[PDB]
Homo-oligomer: A and B are copies of this chain.
Amino acid sequence: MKTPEDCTGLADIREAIDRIDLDIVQALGRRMDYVKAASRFAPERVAAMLPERARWAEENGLDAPFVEGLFAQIIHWYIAEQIKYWRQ
């Protein structure tokens, strides 16, 4: 994939963004599959995770607050899904 500076037009940009978004989706897909795995083995967890992701956003030129909110969103869905999967 061309680097953003190597891109020669909107088409490159759009496809790059499509590939990246799809990677995110698949990553989320593999992420939720670990719910099944976890079952065969506290908010304290969320408390630890969010600040680590906030650091990661920083290291990637992103706005920490926004990135943090996304994962709280993602993490709460995963937890709830765990309980839901629990009641197979």
Shortest CB-to-CB span from A37 to chain B, Å, is 4
Chain A interface, >50% SS class? helix
Question: How many copies are assembled?
Answer: 2
A33 to B27, CA, bound (A): 20
Point out the residues of chain B lying under 8 angstroms from A66, CB to CB: 77
Of the candidates B17, B30, B49, B67, which one forms a contact with A34 in the assembled complex, judged by CB atoms under 8 Å apart?
Answer: B17
Interface residues on chain A, size class: 35 or more
Known contacts A53-B25, A73-B70: does B31 contact A17 (CB below 8 Å)?
yes
Point out the residues of chain B lying under 8 angstroms from A14, CB to CB: 45
Establish whether residues A28 and B32, one from each chain, have CB atoms under 8 Å apart when the complex forms: no
Establish whether residues B71 and A29, one from each chain, have CB atoms under 8 Å apart when the complex forms: no
Point out the residues of chain B lying under 8 angstroms from A73, CB to CB: 70
Residue of B nearest to A69 (CB): B73
Shortest CB-to-CB span from A61 to chain B, Å, is 6
